[PDB]
Amino acid sequence: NAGTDINYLSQRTANFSDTRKLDPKTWAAQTRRRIATDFPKGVYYCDNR
Amino acid sequence: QQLTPAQQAALRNQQAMAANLQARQIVLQQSYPVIQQVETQTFDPANRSVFDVTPANVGIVKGFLVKVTAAITNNHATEAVALTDFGPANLVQRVIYYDPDNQRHTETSGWHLHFVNTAKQGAPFLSSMVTDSPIKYGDVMNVIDAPATIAAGATGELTMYYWVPLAYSETDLTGAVLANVPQSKQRLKLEFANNNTAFAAVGANPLEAIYQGAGAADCEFEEISYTVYQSYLDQLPVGQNGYILPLIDLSTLYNLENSAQAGLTPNVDFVVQYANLYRYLSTIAVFDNGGSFNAGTDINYLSQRTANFSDTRKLDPKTWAAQTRRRIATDFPKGVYYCDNRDKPIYTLQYGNVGFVVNPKTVNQNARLLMGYEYFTSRTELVN
Amino acid sequence: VQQLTPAQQAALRNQQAMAANLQARQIVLQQSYPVIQQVETQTFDPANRSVFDVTPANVGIVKGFLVKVTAAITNNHATEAVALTDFGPANLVQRVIYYDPDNQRHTETSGWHLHFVNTAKQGAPFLSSMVTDSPIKYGDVMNVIDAPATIAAGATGELTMYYWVPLAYSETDLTGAVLANVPQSKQRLKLEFANNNTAFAAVGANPLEAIYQGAGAADCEFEEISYTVYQSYLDQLPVGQNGYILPLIDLSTLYNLENSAQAGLTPNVDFVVQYANLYRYLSTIAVFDNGGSFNAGTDINYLSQRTANFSDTRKLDPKTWAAQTRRRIATDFPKGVYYCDNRDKPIYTLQYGNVGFVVNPKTVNQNARLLMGYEYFTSRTELVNAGTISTT
Amino acid sequence: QQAALRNQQAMAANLQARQIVLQQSYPVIQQVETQTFDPANRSVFDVTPANVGIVKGFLVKVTAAITNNHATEAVALTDFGPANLVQRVIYYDPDNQRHTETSGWHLHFVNTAKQGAPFLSSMVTDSPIKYGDVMNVIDAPATIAAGATGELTMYYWVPLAYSETDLTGAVLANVPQSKQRLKLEFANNNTAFAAVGANPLEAIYQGAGAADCEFEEISYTVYQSYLDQLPVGQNGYILPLIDLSTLYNLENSAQAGLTPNVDFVVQYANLYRYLSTIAVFDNGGSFNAGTDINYLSQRTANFSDTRKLDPKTWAAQTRRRIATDFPKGVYYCDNRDKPIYTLQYGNVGFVVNPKTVNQNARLLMGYEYFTSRTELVNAG
Amino acid sequence: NRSVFDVTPANVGIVKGFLVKVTAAITNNHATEAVALTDFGPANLVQRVIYYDPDNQRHTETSGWHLHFVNTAKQGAPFLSSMVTDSPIKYGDVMNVIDAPATIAAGATGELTMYYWVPLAYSETDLTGAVLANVPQSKQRLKLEFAN
Amino acid sequence: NAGTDINYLSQRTANFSDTRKLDPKTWAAQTRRRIATDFPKGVYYCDNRDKPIYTLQYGNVGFVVNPKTVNQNARLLMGYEYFTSRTELVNAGTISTT
């Protein structure tokens, strides 16, 4: 599914809490800045380069 | 020695500039970026359309990503409405930010902020590029989206995103806002569209509207929702005196603002002077020709001119558009013209007064130029 | 021969201290530059919230805050109107409290008392526009402090009110000012606004704290309220071989406004409200809330200020008392509101209740009481360790 | 290290002389000239003051009769009304140096700012004793109906000395045969009446019958205020040399180029110590009560601001100075205790960020300032 | 309309914790059926609480139900409860400090009150975990995410 | 009444302000921690055992009640537990704020 089965995604840690707890569309927005489009349905990407 | 105060102050700068850059480099190499939700609200703009969001006071703030969704219903008996050229970019009419000292930074329209977001990305902001790939990449998540038309009796769903910058970029902290402290509240103020601004009747000016068509009078928002995410740097490096901070970066304002200018007449140079002291990074000029937005056909040429009547880029509309295609890989909507001055910001006092010029071929009633600026500028000094 | 005298000055001592304080004050005023700056603006619906804590900027020497309040009031009643109470827009703010960086409170009073002091200090109704025969169109052009006399059934009225919350006594006397450059510790300016429960009084109800009263009151409501706080301070403080040249007495003295309520009035009997010791009372305001009725002196025999052993220093009939006030503000305060100026020679008892404010009532209704308002100076240490108000 | 001391001592020595002059001389107010004329023939006059003692200023009385010859339409006072009976004033001292050069309306607004209330007005009170507008000192009919003739009276104080107690800017005129020049340009049939829809800024009346309005006549009387019987000492005349070598002037200017939501900055010049600033927002002939402005301020350019305020709060500060508001679109700023003094040209600017800008918009500026004589007076 | 709030604590002295009073009115508009309290009931009025100190260091971040169970464990009895006894003097649930109707019938409106203690300091006598402020900087942040 | 006729209660020192200005239910919550239940209707308790109220000057500290509704013949009946210096009570003591 295109994010409709997810509340949010994040990277969490171990002091702060989450460093990027985001709804699926906002998470996808960050990915659009990296590959100029969305990955296929149900595929989520995270850049920590 | 002879103390040449002017030469010296410059020297003092030169050292100031170097210190700033080093501090910036150290900050970037040493804190950890965080983006976290600050506030979400769902409402009917018929009830309320202005909201004052209170950002969290933590570390150095770089900017805010604002997600906006909306549902619009066309209850006209028979007629549809179609997206205007700006469409969902008009979901937010105005945005204003104030820092902890209550100093105002950006104050501009949603459409201008959106065009700058696009210029800074180098492509339509958060868009999905079309390719021949058989793998199913594409508009999967509808990050920024709005139906091309909303038929009589139908309800359409829209999604829009705006990045409200404080810092100039992810690597250049000029304009960022400094949280090691005490200070006040910013007042990220968001003024949303409502039934009056979002729908334009046939023949009415579509500038600020989202949809225009024969069914406009019976269109209504059902709801609008926003979620503001704050992007900042945490775990600020500490050294000797306390926090290692880029003092020039944090005491410089990086702002967007817009205004409207009128007084255009056919074949005469319409000159909009740059308001001195600011370092203008970009200029957007929208030729709202009395509600008509044309693809360059109502313009002879555009230019940037300095106090000697010397043009640095006097170009016909298509050639002007060509330069923009090199910047954002496509054209801005009809009647929207962009000018990049990022590497050499327009700065009067460096070379006399400068002006943005438009020589119109046709001028309808109520014609005007809506100017959008992106700038830094700070304090200024001198002596005999 | 109210008593202790001018021996209070022999006691403080540091003619050297005063000489220094005063010289430093003058250098600061001469060398620094005045700034008035917006620190916060907010719009809200009283139905959701009405209490706000504003955080001032910690910069230089803070003199005070100018608070601008605007509001839209809708009379949703079907057929009845409402009209302004005597205090009207002065009740847009119910209370104010200020805490400095050292957690010490300065002013803690009602919006109406604060407003009356603003008027007393200006020498005329605060920020008012005086009427003259000038043919040139000066006048109430900008509606600085403004409110519709009535709001008819179904109508919406727009109001504007301003309050000056003082820290410093005046633009030239920095007594009471706050040094906020020196600690990261925050200041607190607490504001409690009128709400749908306090702004509207039904016919026959007490209008003291209300803005409008009338037959349509039950159906009146705020459409919204907005406030903007401007902070006034001195920047670019002068430095010497010591460092910052500062008036130490000015900055270690509190200039506060405070209110209180007293009851127990009986016809033809002196009702005495005792002044506390250690405070130097600059002015006194007494409001005779005669069970919800506010009269123009007709319910009072006389008012006075009295010292235990001597008698009264100004026992006067209500009209003569009002005459003294007309010399101070060029008009009368609203019905039932009485003012007393003691600025040149502040009431200072050294013993609690040496000094009392007197009201001998002619008629006393049910639930009668005197609402007192005070302006005073104090030695910040004396208020910390040895102070009450209120004489029972 | 001696500079500041030398300055303090010179100031201490000015001040003593000033006090002796105020104490020993005697104030005189005397008529120097009266004239009645028809604006159709002339409207510019050069009055020659008397060269006696220390001149402090001139009180100019102006009366006029205006006839509305229109068949059926009336006219009504503009916001400035009788303050536009004098369009401009210019004063030249015996040394050919100009002091004030400004408009009649700006001069009038400064007269008001200095009085602390509408100049020479009659305040309304509840007094049963019949005080009130008995003498119609400054007066003009609110409207002049078709066929009617209205009578107007206006007074202006042209200052040389700053006040009755501060002689800064005063002129020593008993020292030369060289004449003073007080130039006055009066309203005429072309400036006094504005047609509906026309800019009323410089007019006295506006309305449907304006085209047929005319002056029946105008009269003026100039009274000169000076100090006589100047005190003499040892070396001779005891005089405040700083006071008499300083100019106290009012001047006006116009600036254009306003754009919605953009800071419009009018730079202050260097050398001048600006005591007050008046800015009139002539929004293309429309004068609004702050609704066309976002905020006003005084700044170090790009920096800020020492008083960036919304229009109502700006007006609140003015209410503390003149006990009322100036007319629509007129904004005042008091800097008397700490005059704007840049050394640098433009370090400081007056700011107006407009909300709405009509065609032909502009800011009409008015300034009160002190500046500075290069060289002392001629002494005996 | 809104369920997440960022409260800004005052910066004064050593902070030990926060007592959060929460009240609510709930209406059951079902045509015929009632609803009954869950085992956690009003403890679920607050879904999550997160605190950050002046240096933006996160301390507690947990659910309302977990915070409530710890409040109970630290008290040694159900948090802020009223114990039942045979006393004829009218002590008892007089003030409804923590309270919620056992059921809300179709068409009825129930009122609830709940309290949570968000600790920084471990206890009134053990200041381990307390937060100063002699910290030039920020402000603290107490984020409350409510039920909807 | 069970707190419904009161806006708030507090203990205040002249110059600082209140050390515990609380709504009636929150005031009752503190009491529940002390006696495991509520005192009867209209009865309010305040524990200052670890740091006893000790003014050195009369009235430096006061107990505050801001009533929401006041009926005819209303009054506050106060009860105190204290340790005094036997000599101070002998020579310098009253109870009483009018």
Number of C to E CB contacts under 8 A, please give it: 14
Question: For B140, which of A19, A23, A41 is closest by C-beta distance?
Answer: A41
How far, in Å, CA of C60 to CA of C62, rounded? 6
Burial of B218 (0-12, 13-18, 19+ CB in 10 A): middle
Q: Are D348 and D298 in contact (CB under 8 A)?
A: yes
- SS3 helix, strand, coil % of chain F, rounded to 5? 20, 20, 60
One-letter amino acid for residue D142 of the chain: A
Q: Are D157 and D57 in contact (CB under 8 A)?
A: yes
How far, in Å, CA of D172 to CA of D185, rounded? 25
C53 touches chain E (CB under 8 A): yes
Three-state secondary-structure class, residue D147: coil
E12 touches chain C (CB under 8 A): yes
A34 touches chain B (CB under 8 A): no
Task: Please compute, for residue D17, the number of CA atoms within 13 A of its CA located in the half-sphere on the CB side.
Answer: 21
Strand B92-98 versus strand B104-109 pairing type: antiparallel
Q: Give the CA distances from residue D316 to residues B80, C127, C143, D40, in Å, rounded to whole numbers and listed in that order.
A: 51, 6, 9, 43
Three-state secondary-structure class, residue D254: strand
How far, in Å, CA of C25 to CA of C147, rounded? 39
Q: Residue B349 gets which letter from DSSP?
A: T
Q: What are φ and ψ of residue B49, in 5° steps?
A: -125, -5
How far, in Å, CA of B332 to CA of B323, rounded? 12
Decide if C55 and B102 are in contact by the 8 Å CB cutoff.
no
Q: Are C318 and C302 in contact (CB under 8 A)?
A: yes
> Residue C65 pairs with which residues in a beta bridge?
C165, C231
Q: Other CB atoms closer than 10 Å to residue C382's CB: what's the count?
A: 16
Instruction: Pull the structure tokens for residue B26.
Output: 């150290």
Q: Are C287 and C91 in contact (CB under 8 A)?
A: no
How far, in Å, CA of E20 to CA of E46, rounded? 10
How far, in Å, CA of B125 to CA of B107, rounded? 20
B383 touches chain D (CB under 8 A): yes
One-letter amino acid for residue D129 of the chain: I
Q: Are B166 and B104 in contact (CB under 8 A)?
A: no
Residue (of B158, B206, B222) closest to B336 by Cα position: B206
**Which residues lie closer than 8 Å to C158 by C-beta, 6 or more apart?**
C70, C71, C72, C146, C148
As a dihedral over the C-alpha atoms of residue B174, residue B175, residue B176, residue B179, rounded to 10 degrees, the angle is 120
Beta strand extents in E53-135 (DSSP E only): 58-63, 103-104, 109-119
Q: Are C337 and C285 in contact (CB under 8 A)?
A: yes
As a dihedral over the C-alpha atoms of residue C158, residue B194, residue B367, residue B355, rounded to 10 degrees, the angle is 80
> Residue B156 pairs with which residues in a beta bridge?
B72
As a dihedral over the C-alpha atoms of residue D64, residue D68, residue D69, residue D74, rounded to 10 degrees, the angle is 180
B15 touches chain E (CB under 8 A): no
Kind plus residue range of the DSSP H or E element containing B324? helix B317-328
Residue (of E144, E140, E136) closest to E8 by Cα position: E140
Tell me, rounded to whole angstroms, the distance of Cα D222 from its chain centroid: 16
Q: Other CB atoms closer than 10 Å to residue D80's CB: what's the count?
A: 25
Decide if D324 and C140 are in contact by the 8 Å CB cutoff.
yes
How far, in Å, CA of D123 to CA of D113, rounded? 16
Strand D264-267 versus strand D348-354 pairing type: antiparallel
How far, in Å, CA of C376 to CA of B332, rounded? 65
Q: Are C329 and C120 in contact (CB under 8 A)?
A: yes
Kind plus residue range of the DSSP H or E element containing D220? strand D213-228
Decide if A17 and E57 are in contact by the 8 Å CB cutoff.
no
Residue (of C130, C160, C139, C137) closest to C148 by Cα position: C160
How far, in Å, CA of D124 to CA of C131, rounded? 6
Task: Please compute, for residue D376, the number of CA atoms within 13 A of its CA located in the half-sphere on the CB side.
Answer: 9
How far, in Å, CA of C119 to CA of C115, rounded? 6
Residue numbers preceding breaks in chain F (C to N > 2.5 A): none
Instruction: Pull the structure tokens for residue D270.
Output: 């260097």
Residue with tokens 């250098």: C27
How far, in Å, CA of D120 to CA of D108, rounded? 10
How far, in Å, CA of C11 to CA of E2, rounded? 60
Chains touching B by CB (3 or more pairs below 8 Å):
A, C, D, E
Q: CA angle, corner B81, sides to B338 and B48, nearest 5?
A: 80
Tell me the nearest-neighbour CA distance from E108 into chain F, angstroms: 22
Residue numbers preceding breaks in chain E (C to N > 2.5 A): none
Task: Please compute, for residue C39, the number of CA atoms within 13 A of its CA located in the half-sphere on the CB side.
Answer: 25
How far, in Å, CA of B243 to CA of B233, rounded? 13
**Which residues lie closer than 8 Å to B359 by C-beta, 6 or more apart?**
B267, B268, B269, B270, B299, B300, B301, B302
Q: Are C64 and C170 in contact (CB under 8 A)?
A: no
User: Which phi-psi region, left, alpha or beta, contains residue A17 (left: φ > 0; alpha: ψ -120 to 50)?
Assistant: left
Chain F residue with minimum CA distance to E96: F25
Chains touching F by CB (3 or more pairs below 8 Å):
C, E
How far, in Å, CA of D11 to CA of D22, rounded? 17
How far, in Å, CA of E42 to CA of D161, rounded? 78
To one decimal, the resolution in angstroms is 4.2
Do chains A and C touch by CB distance (3+ pairs < 8 Å)?
Answer: no
Strand D193-194 versus strand B255-262 pairing type: unpaired
In B, which residues are within 8 Å of A32 by CB distance? 126-128, 143
Decide if D260 and B259 are in contact by the 8 Å CB cutoff.
yes
